[PDB]
Write a protein that binds this ligand. Sequence first.
Ligand SMILES: CNCC[C@H](Oc1ccc(C(F)(F)F)cc1)c1ccccc1
Ligand SMILES: CC(C)C[C@H](N)C(=O)O
Ligand code: NA
Ligand code: NA
Length: 501
Amino acid sequence: REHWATRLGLILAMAGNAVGLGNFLRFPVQAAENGGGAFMIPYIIAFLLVGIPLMWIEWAMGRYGGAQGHGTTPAIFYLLWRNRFAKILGVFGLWIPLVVAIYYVYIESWTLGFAIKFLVGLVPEPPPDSILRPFKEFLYSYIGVPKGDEPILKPSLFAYIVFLITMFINVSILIRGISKGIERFAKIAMPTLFILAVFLVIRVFLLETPNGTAADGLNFLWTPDFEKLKDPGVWIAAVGQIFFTLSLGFGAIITYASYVRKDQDIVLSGLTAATLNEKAEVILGGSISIPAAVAFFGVANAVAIAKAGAFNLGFITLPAIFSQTAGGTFLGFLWFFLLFFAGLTSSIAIMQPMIAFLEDELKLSRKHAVLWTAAIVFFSAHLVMFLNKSLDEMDFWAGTIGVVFFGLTELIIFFWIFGADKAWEEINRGGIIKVPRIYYYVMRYITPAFLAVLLVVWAREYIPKIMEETHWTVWITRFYIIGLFLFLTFLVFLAERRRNH
Ligand SMILES: CNCC[C@H](Oc1ccc(C(F)(F)F)cc1)c1ccccc1
Ligand SMILES: CC(C)C[C@H](N)C(=O)O
Ligand code: NA
Ligand code: NA
């Protein structure tokens, strides 16, 4: 089996897995829409009660799986629970990261496209709405937002070609393997990512207009609002963000952990990777978009902008703000270059589970596993590129509801079916430090009850609206992703047949 070469390489690759587009694009939007500091309390709580325990659980399952030659959940779920149904539930741990990858790599390619255009200065120029409109139109031409009745997207030729280059970049890393590809790239990307982010945070701090400063944005984000801790919509938002941001329930952490040696520590390593992400999220990610928006527009306007769109902040508002400053075009470039490296280190992570399945279970070489995985993702992404609201549908079913459901599933299998005491032992085995004894009770009683309650409220108060009050074209996307599940179910069926022959 492939293994991580260095300790630091492992940490940086795992942090590169988590530290992604979610830190800089998803988190600011979620927080702004949920009363800033009103969001943070549920967020911190969810991090302590859901994020941390599941991180250790996924590292545990991965290392346990890898020791026996299996990187993905179809096989790992079966190892923990010798039942046919465990293999089928395990498909979600291939399905989720595949579907997520299908739209994620595409968003990632927008950041490269924008980076290029901002570096070369092929960007709009201002002559409040006269400031935003040219940048709105710039993004709308790029991705091809529908102008009329038809739910059809028309991406520019540049966007399409940049998507191809992005696929090629992802492949060039992944084809070199774990230590020589993913690890080596992480050691380059992460320091760069941190430097650019710190630079941009510092630069944003210096912004002031007659409407406010950056500090006003931080005050909005860090003033606890106790009159919102009763809204279930905020708690759903916070827990969802925690899963997405930490790459939990994507089977991606598990797959990375399957290249960790049987004896090596996962307790401190896991905690470090999780804490590195939260610092990049709340300190770095939280200090760029919102404070800049609040500084130019005030709190009320910044929230309203964050509500009328989620790519409004990162692709429209921020570059618009930057263009009003000296060297703003280059500042835009640094923003989009930061985003590109944030995305890239995470997109290689959510394609690796499919690659590892093909290698481990169907005994394909790395070359063919990577190329076939890329081909599947490349082809499928045409739905995201050309069909309006296809991105939102995949992001909901796989990257939002799917991950929470899968987190609960993997927790139940590992802690309730495999055995709580066996699970605990497997977590702590070889650890530099031990997990606090309190977390056993959290993992076994608190976390599962909390997620189960959350999913029941979710499926009764929120999913009826999405199932019923959306455009008919969502069924094309639903149909296709259900098809992907059946296809993956079929590959698992072939994998066990091949094992017998
Ligand atoms: C414009 N429609 C998309 C809604 C938006 O989707 C997103 C999907 C992916 C990402 C990112 F960039 F991957 F983090 C960020 C946002 C979203 C989803 C959930 C919560 C906030 C925003
Ligand atoms: C799907 C995951 C790899 C996403 C990543 N954790 C992020 O915050 O962008
Ligand atoms: Na993250
Ligand atoms: Na990343």
